[PDB]
Amino acid sequence: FFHHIFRPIVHVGKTIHRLVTG
């Protein structure tokens, strides 16, 4: 995944994820 080439940009990564699952 594009998480090793850049810092830990998992922030909104969970945001949208919070709407796909919730």
**C-alpha span between 13 and 8 (Å, rounded):** 10
List CB contacts of 9: < 8 A, sequence separation 6 or more.
Answer: 3
The first and second tokens of residue 17, run together, are 């994820």
Q: What is the DSSP letter of 2?
A: T
Distance CA 7, CA 22 (A): 26
Distance of CA 8 to the CA centre of its chain: 9
Torsion over CA of 10, 15, 17 and 1, rounded to 10 degrees? -20
Q: Which token pair is 5?
A: 């080439």
- To which H or E segment does residue 16 belong? helix 11-21
Rounded Cα gap, residues 11 and 22, in angstroms: 16
Name residue 17's amino acid.
H
How many residues can be counted in the chain? 22
Euclidean distance between CA atoms 4 and 20, whole angstroms: 23
Residue pair 3/10 in contact (Cβ under 8 Å)? The answer is yes
